[PDB]
Design a protein around this ligand. Structure first.
Ligand SMILES: Nc1nc2ncc(CO)nc2c(=O)[nH]1
Ligand SMILES: Nc1nc2ncc(CO)nc2c(=O)[nH]1
Lengths: 274, 274
């Protein structure tokens, strides 16, 4: 029943949506390969595309302003021209937010939740949906009084901060920030996955992304390439609880698992596992 | 907290157990390959082994008595000699039940729920745990007043029938009979998967097996070899609800998904998703 609206089109969150990842970093063949990877993800079943001109996993470098315009914008521009899928942009600079909205972007997905100077002001001018994600800080993960309580308290503060800028509450999306890069260890990560359905009291969409993360690599004791089954198990658990968007690397397999989730949630009485 | 007891050892159903499938049908190299496949499944994480001298998927042939002794018994006998895993036997004849219990079998897993003449009497003499599975009838699946109500009513009748023979209720195991070979179509199969946790009112173990079945092949529209992701999604849904044994073909991936399930059920408040 929950819908997202952007660029004269809608996203019906009645079923779980799979959002494929498309990193555009180290440009002649960097654009052909981007359109072809995006094409492959659409044919596998992806309904959203996460174009991010920055890798910020702990220990990754900084990208100046002009650098992100040169890769994010032509990629975003190329997707909307030829495809129907929704395009989310992983950017924190206000200039990339303004230019992504011009070339046809749908969702503003900021890893920093629009904390950079001018970022929140830009995201409101675009009128686009913004995804708010929680994060604390290659260093360690801090200590919490209770990881679920603080993430919740981080939200109420962020929704209130959004509405103060003109971004209506109905445009927002929430993401707990799974991963040992946003300041949460293995116990904190699995506590959030276990209590995900409680986050629905906000009555807002739940973007979730745990694809190939450390919360699967450390538990299963496998390299970064053998984490498919664990990522699928994570995605099903989140979708079983009513997560609306699942941000994954392996789109074909995730989409297959989602269809089992839908066929399961369709026969249930209340469409959600608590 | 629920335990199974057989052959002087125990099975602690505090975590989901993965039961690998080992079919012994069309014998010189048929035994080496059986021990080696069983070995591979143990190293992948399987704690139970399903040795079945019969394939009875719709359209499969009949095996005489002496034929099953020649393959089931030496295979069961070979596993208990060299490995610690539990051995379940897919047999309906009373003679194979008596001889499997002699060579070291753990669980009597009858696809027919001991309906053959003399089968129930044998399973009681062994004192072993029996798995009761529901089934109606290459033909079609019948019409139900309500598929959950009848399967439940099929149980109460079967537990009562077991106790009348001396098989204590604490030795029994239940299995809904997922699959379009036991008389249940795509809607009936997903109704049972959606309402699995309700079956716990019996306070008994839940054996579940949907590996590579038609309820995944028909929904995803893929050949019998590309059903891994859908089978993993099914297994997680059942384990999320508290299924205790998951009967799968792909043990390494299932075991990986179960560890995510355990790590998730460990951080939850009540260890079960309803
Ligand atoms: N919304 C969202 N964005 C992310 N971006 C990057 C990374 C990791 O680099 N993770 C996430 C995530 O988990 N959720
Ligand atoms: N317990 C159990 N046994 C089975 N045996 C055979 C087959 C299919 O040949 N399925 C099952 C099953 O789903 N559960």
């Amino acid at each position: 029943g929950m819908k997202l609206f952007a660029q004269g089109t809608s996203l019906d969150l009645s079923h779980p949506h799979v959002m494929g990842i498309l990193n555009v970093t180290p440009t002649h063949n960097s654009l052909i390969d981007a359109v072809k990877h995006a094409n492959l993800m659409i044919n596998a079943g992806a309904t959203i595309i996460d174009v991010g001109g920055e890798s910020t996993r702990p220990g990754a470098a900084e990208v100046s302003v002009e650098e992100e315009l040169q890769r994010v914008i032509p990629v975003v521009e190329a997707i909307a021209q030829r495809f129907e899928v929704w395009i989310s942009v992983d950017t924190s600079k206000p200039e990339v937010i303004r230019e992504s909205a011009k070339v046809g972007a749908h969702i503003i997905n900021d890893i920093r939740s629009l904390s950079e100077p001018g970022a929140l002001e830009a995201a409101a001018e675009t009128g686009l949906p913004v995804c708010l994600m929680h994060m604390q800080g290659m260093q360690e993960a801090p200590k919490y009084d209770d990881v679920f309580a603080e993430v919740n308290r981080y939200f109420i503060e962020q929704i209130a901060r959004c509405e103060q800028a003109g971004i209506a509450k109905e445009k927002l999306l929430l993401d707990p920030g799974f991963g040992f890069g946003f300041g949460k260890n293995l116990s904190h990560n699995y506590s959030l996955l276990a209590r995900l359905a409680e986050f629905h009291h906000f009555n807002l969409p739940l973007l979730v992304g745990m694809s190939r993360k450390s919360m699967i690599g450390q538990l299963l004791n496998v390299g970064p390439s053998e984490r498919l089954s664990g990522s699928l198990a994570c995605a099903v658990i989140a979708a079983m609880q009513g997560a609306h968007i699942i941000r994954v690397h392996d789109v074909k397999e995730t989409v297959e698992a989602m269809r089992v989730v839908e066929a399961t949630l369709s026969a249930k009485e209340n469409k959600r596992y608590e």
